[PDB]
Ligand binder design. Sequence first.
Ligand SMILES: Nc1ccnc2c1ncn2[C@@H]1O[C@H](CO)[C@@H](O)[C@H]1O
Ligand SMILES: Nc1ccnc2c1ncn2[C@@H]1O[C@H](CO)[C@@H](O)[C@H]1O
Ligand SMILES: Nc1ccnc2c1ncn2[C@@H]1O[C@H](CO)[C@@H](O)[C@H]1O
Ligand SMILES: Nc1ccnc2c1ncn2[C@@H]1O[C@H](CO)[C@@H](O)[C@H]1O
Ligand SMILES: Nc1ccnc2c1ncn2[C@@H]1O[C@H](CO)[C@@H](O)[C@H]1O
Ligand SMILES: Nc1ccnc2c1ncn2[C@@H]1O[C@H](CO)[C@@H](O)[C@H]1O
Ligand SMILES: [Cl-]
Ligand SMILES: [Cl-]
Ligand SMILES: [Cl-]
Ligand SMILES: [Cl-]
Ligand SMILES: [Cl-]
Ligand SMILES: [Cl-]
Ligand SMILES: [Cl-]
Ligand SMILES: [Cl-]
Ligand SMILES: [Cl-]
Lengths: 281, 281, 281, 282, 282, 282
Amino acid sequence: RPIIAFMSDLGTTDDSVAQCKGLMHSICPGVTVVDVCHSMTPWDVEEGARYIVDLPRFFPEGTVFATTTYPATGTTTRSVAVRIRQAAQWAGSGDGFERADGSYIYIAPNNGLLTTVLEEHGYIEAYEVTSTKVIPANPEPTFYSREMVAIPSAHLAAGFPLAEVGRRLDDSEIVRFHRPAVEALSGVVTAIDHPFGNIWTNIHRTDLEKAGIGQGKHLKIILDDVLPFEAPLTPTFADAGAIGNIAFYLNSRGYLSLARNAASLAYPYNLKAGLKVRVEA
Amino acid sequence: RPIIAFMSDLGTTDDSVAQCKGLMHSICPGVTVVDVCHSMTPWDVEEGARYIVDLPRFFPEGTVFATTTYPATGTTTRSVAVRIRQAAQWAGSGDGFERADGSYIYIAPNNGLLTTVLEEHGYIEAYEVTSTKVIPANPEPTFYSREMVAIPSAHLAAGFPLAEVGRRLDDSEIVRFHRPAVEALSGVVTAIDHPFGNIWTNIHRTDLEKAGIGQGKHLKIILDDVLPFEAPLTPTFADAGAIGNIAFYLNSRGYLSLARNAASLAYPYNLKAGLKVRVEA
Amino acid sequence: RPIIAFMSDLGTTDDSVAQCKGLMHSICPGVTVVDVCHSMTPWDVEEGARYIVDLPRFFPEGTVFATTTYPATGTTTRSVAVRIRQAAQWAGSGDGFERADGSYIYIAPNNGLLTTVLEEHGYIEAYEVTSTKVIPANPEPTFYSREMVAIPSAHLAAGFPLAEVGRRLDDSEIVRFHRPAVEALSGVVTAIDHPFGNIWTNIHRTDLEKAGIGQGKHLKIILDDVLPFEAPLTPTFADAGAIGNIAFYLNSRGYLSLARNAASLAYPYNLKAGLKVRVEA
Amino acid sequence: RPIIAFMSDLGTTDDSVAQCKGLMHSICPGVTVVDVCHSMTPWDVEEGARYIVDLPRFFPEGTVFATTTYPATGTTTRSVAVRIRQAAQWAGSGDGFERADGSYIYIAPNNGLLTTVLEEHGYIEAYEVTSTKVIPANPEPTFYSREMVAIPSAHLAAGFPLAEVGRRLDDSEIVRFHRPAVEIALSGVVTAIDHPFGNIWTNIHRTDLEKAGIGQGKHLKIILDDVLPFEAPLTPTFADAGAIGNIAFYLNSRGYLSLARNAASLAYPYNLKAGLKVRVEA
Amino acid sequence: RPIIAFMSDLGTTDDSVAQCKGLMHSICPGVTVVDVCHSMTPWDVEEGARYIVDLPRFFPEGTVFATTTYPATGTTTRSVAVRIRQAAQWAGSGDGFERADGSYIYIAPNNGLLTTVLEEHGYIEAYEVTSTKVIPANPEPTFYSREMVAIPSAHLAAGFPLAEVGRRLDDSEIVRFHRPAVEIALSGVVTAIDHPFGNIWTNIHRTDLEKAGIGQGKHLKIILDDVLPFEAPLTPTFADAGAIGNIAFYLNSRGYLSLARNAASLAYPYNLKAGLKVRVEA
Amino acid sequence: RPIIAFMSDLGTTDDSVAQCKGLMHSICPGVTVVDVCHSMTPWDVEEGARYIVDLPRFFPEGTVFATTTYPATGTTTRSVAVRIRQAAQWAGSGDGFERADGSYIYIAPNNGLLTTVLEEHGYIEAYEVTSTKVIPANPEPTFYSREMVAIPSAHLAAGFPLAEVGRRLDDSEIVRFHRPAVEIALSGVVTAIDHPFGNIWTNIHRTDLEKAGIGQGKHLKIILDDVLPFEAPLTPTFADAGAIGNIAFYLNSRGYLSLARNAASLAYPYNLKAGLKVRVEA
Ligand SMILES: Nc1ccnc2c1ncn2[C@@H]1O[C@H](CO)[C@@H](O)[C@H]1O
Ligand SMILES: Nc1ccnc2c1ncn2[C@@H]1O[C@H](CO)[C@@H](O)[C@H]1O
Ligand SMILES: Nc1ccnc2c1ncn2[C@@H]1O[C@H](CO)[C@@H](O)[C@H]1O
Ligand SMILES: Nc1ccnc2c1ncn2[C@@H]1O[C@H](CO)[C@@H](O)[C@H]1O
Ligand SMILES: Nc1ccnc2c1ncn2[C@@H]1O[C@H](CO)[C@@H](O)[C@H]1O
Ligand SMILES: Nc1ccnc2c1ncn2[C@@H]1O[C@H](CO)[C@@H](O)[C@H]1O
Ligand SMILES: [Cl-]
Ligand SMILES: [Cl-]
Ligand SMILES: [Cl-]
Ligand SMILES: [Cl-]
Ligand SMILES: [Cl-]
Ligand SMILES: [Cl-]
Ligand SMILES: [Cl-]
Ligand SMILES: [Cl-]
Ligand SMILES: [Cl-]
């Protein structure tokens, strides 16, 4: 019972996503399509990477990940299809559901979208998608998200051999983007968690415990060099005490974050991604 | 062929809902997940209750209702799992599809979310959700909507015995919220029906016929003590005559409501929930 | 394995769509419901027609199309159910998936919604939907999108004979709307493609090649008689050269369109549908 | 002690008005320039009319009114200068300042701006402003508000003869506009939102009311835009609505039926703007 | 050389203020009307108070202050006219203009508008304005700002006797309001956003500071609305924050602790408005 | 009959400007203060420059221009006072008011505000304002617009000697800014949106045009922000665009190429703001 998890920049105000799904079913009958998100900022590769990087451990083995923002649609560019190694705490009841390696496939424009996927998970082999068996002989130039991602993803869900979609790629041929690094820790606001107004940073758990920082530690987190927040590190929001109170926590992705307890922190003060972050103890 | 109807405050701008669905499928293969809404105002329990209270009669028997806003995520709080009694006019073709009792299960934070569910439908037994068989041994503090609702809901859809998720609860142990009552009838605007701009009140059919009010009766409905609307009670919008004309009707949930015929009433004049309502004849 | 593609004006902020889906499953167990869009402007028939007109070739044969905006809900009006002729370049891998005729069914309010469907595709026979076997004996006046579209659509997906839903209609009895025609070509902006900000016009490929216009031709496209854009006709966005540069192209629906390469054209300058269009060479 | 009362659409965000004022002082030294308003909606002649039609009784005899919105600036269109007749119950302390006839001059573009001035005050002699003694020989094309209104207004204030500004006009040569009508239950329109209070003015006059048997203390239903309803008695002032926030129907200082909330804004919360239909039923 | 300083809530988008000015000139010829502000939030008495409480030392002796927001217009409510005592370190060049006592008159609605004028300047004689020699016999009900403030202000400016405007009041007859308190770590509130700069004024006075041992050059943490934090030393001016955009804590020209960014706006980016709680901790 | 023309960034929503005016009257009795503008964008020196560079020819000889935006208030930064040379075809009726040389004084912060005044009018003697005879001995740190501009402007208007305000400056001591350049097809920038009409001013001058062989009645293509295109002939005024709403390219009263719609706003509908690139091609 095959699954395609589908992430795109196609939006939710027209038939575009539905066209893709129609084909997915046409090709892989009995397929279940799980919508990740279709609301991402178009062409914002680094935003899209964030929505797909942590998915594998939550999905059954065999799940195909169709992930696409395709600003170079209609060009010589071709999509890349990749079987990752490690799905990567396990998710689920009990001690979790351990996922076998080489058990997930990403297919995506070769435009950097998979950058964090490949490094957090690794990959066995990557292939350029060119065979007319998994893509159209005459692709609609403007709709590669359908022609060069959705359509072949469904072939791959129906058991089509990855190694036959086209030629094999070298690591150097796989486009990557580059994240700002983390340097007293300096970082950046990665995202606002809608609809809660929570604030996410690029500082990982692993960066804290490397500076002698664990739960309960009193910290200062400064935004934009003008907003000096102060609070103890806590596992969750309610630990901040009263409603509205600032909380400092590690989010479900393993990253230092701020919020208010049952109140929005970002929205009322128009705090957005990009603001810079300084962490002190 | 199990169904999970899923309602949350997780939104539609990231991978959160997808993570949950991935697990649901992992646990209950062949499960179909029906999205109710994920756009509710976070932490607004009474808004979430409104989206889930009328669902059972529309769904096949055996449907599990996973409904969650979890501001106390990461705390001692635990979710409650409940088998309701009456699913409650029947919905469907002909005279409708009669639903057997004890045929639906709700699982939700024990924070008042199910208040109207339990009173409109009743319940056979309620249980605290604690067994590591339906929830993780080490839950992510900030994501109880996944760990303590989504994950066990899928076990319950796969046939896991309700009585084994944890200890049985007493009625007093089930958190409830309290609605403003209805008192010439006085009430309150409960919701604006997007995207139509229709206005919903807490005055039920049953409150009208208890004051000698049936179809065709000329009424006055005043909002905020400054907007005196006048119209006959009618079954639907077009009965108001011309487009734009005010209509007074009972909505599909059985509640007195106002609108314009093929025009928005609320949006142009920024009429929101909370406004108070006076009904006269 | 039956499919219902579902398009409505019911929105995504309440349980309405879910109620419908619940019934669909109740009636046609094992049915897969593919959401097209539920965000259309309510009562805007011509907008809804645009989201459903190009679907058939993307879906498996047998797919039932449940498409509904129902401002005359609760009136004498009844829905129309139609088996189209031609599904209509084929979509998919290779040379595409050829679709047999008479292989798709639309069901919809008889209010003009299907106007472009029937003319672009044709139809074998149309029927008024009245039988209490596919609709309720006592319909909720305000919710015909559920009672007179969703419910019977699921019967039709479960194999119920189209000719038995009610009486057969004459062409004249099928409500239609009328599009502005295309006249140096004059036309109109049909839609803004969210979230990209691309601009769509009513000028078809077929209108260009009828004026000696093919790829590479230098054109001028004027909006609102005040915005004289100039660019060569190109297959896709990146052909415009640098990012931000204007591109003139045929979209995936076969219509002259404008945009910027990896930049929004409409949003920053508040360009909306309705603006008039003049095309020169 | 010459006075020019200055109304324009030039705004409050550049030196336009100040250029004009500098010339007024240049031409007429010792002049006092009283700002009427400079924030009117651009080119909205009927809106400007309301800001200048009630002025004369509040001002000293001989005051010159310089009133301009000049969308046809740079064309053959010229300004007109007019001695009005009646200053029209007086304003001021006691029983008020009695104003003699023919004591005020309006100078404006001949584009209808004065339609209502002439209608309520009548006039005596109107002249086209063409003389290079009171306007520039080579006027800046975009700045006729200055060239054809401000400058000449100052010569007039200095005592320059009205009859010498140019040729005398006939009534048919004075461009006029048509007020929105009141139909008769009364139907009219919202003429203006009174900022910053959010009060709502209609074109419905006291005389239309008393002509439909509607007097003080009486209950009306007013509907805006064919759907938004309000009910209240006709009262003299806002506080008569009782509680803060309550709805009030009154006659404004200009004689027109108006709607408001008491020490709160009615227009803004419902996004009400000029132009909406008004239906009044008793 | 009579002068009336005019503060109202009448706005900048109609002829209201100009009607008032025309009468001032009518009643007191040669008067100069100095606009203070006309854009205050409607009916917000405590906001108006701040725009008129610091004025006297900047103005010539004998200047009359006409200050009005009149939400009770058309009622029994009357205006009060007051000769203040102390003009209160002087403003102007050198060591400043020394202002004699009892040299300024305020006329306003008796609705508390003058609460802070009387508190900081004290007063000598206050009178109720009822005489038909300085107000109209039949006042327009909606326009008391004109009928009961503007008109009488002009007679006063012309030298009309203060004691003759009506009966003399006692302190208990002068309506007053209560300032938002400062609790004591200090807690107060934002009183105003200083446009167009986006600076933020608090009700916390220099004296509250020096009373908590807080002086120049010292580090404070200020929290707005119980969550939005800022840290900086107390400095005399904006540039002392260093780089453009940096946060500054200072005492404004009125003596109140304030927050700002240096040549950049603090309020607008975070949508900060008057009314927010302020917590200052050292 | 002394006159001070007053331009500041102080705004229209408090008593700041009125404090300043009170002192002007205090120091120079009988002075007339002409408001230029007080609504300029805060700290935007080049925007202020445009509101004060065209003024002298419209004003009487001897008028003092008090022009200030003072982001460095409270520092060592001082103001400068300057007698300009050329008042620069005259404004006014007939062939206009001929203005003698050296007849205007500007006083402003030495922060570049006068860059364009000095460039177009030249100057004769510029002085640093330091004397405690024309400024305060203990200036309020946040209010230099008042302490270092308003107060001294008044002494100057009263006839106080310019050379005595402080030491004489050299050209190199007068801070200046750089105008946005015009590159050459011409590329420039939008300098301002002309409110409330929504007209669009560019930095492209008449001389840049006639230097590229571009004259009246000729077709141009103008592109804003590298993507938004407009086409029209160069005409003298808005109506020359024909129909209401139509696009017009013209030279404004200041000599700069500008874009507009005829009796309709161009900027607002497309959200166009100052700063956008402008490309003009013929
Ligand atoms: N104006 C545009 C410029 C570049 N790429 C676009 C544009 N509009 C849509 N796209 C891309 O086309 C893809 C469809 O194949 C979308 O995923 C999207 O990234
Ligand atoms: N800032 C926050 C404070 C309290 N609860 C939150 C916050 N953000 C998300 N949540 C809750 O966490 C749940 C995830 O388990 C969501 O359903 C939501 O209700
Ligand atoms: N205020 C309204 C007036 C007319 N039709 C409405 C209104 N609100 C909802 N509807 C219609 O009712 C249908 C539900 O059956 C929706 O598809 C919608 O088109
Ligand atoms: N874009 C424009 C179109 C038509 N008239 C305008 C425009 N901008 C300014 N004006 C007019 O120019 C006059 C100044 O002479 C103003 O009164 C105003 O009405
Ligand atoms: N809607 C209103 C309610 C109460 N007072 C008002 C209203 N509109 C204007 N006013 C008051 O009328 C006064 C003019 O006399 C103004 O100062 C103002 O305070
Ligand atoms: N937040 C601020 C930063 C820098 N300068 C300011 C600020 N607020 C006001 N000013 C300046 O103070 C001057 C008044 O002396 C004004 O001209 C203005 O430029
Ligand atoms: Cl790409
Ligand atoms: Cl909770
Ligand atoms: Cl319909
Ligand atoms: Cl005046
Ligand atoms: Cl005109
Ligand atoms: Cl003044
Ligand atoms: Cl009052
Ligand atoms: Cl003046
Ligand atoms: Cl400065």
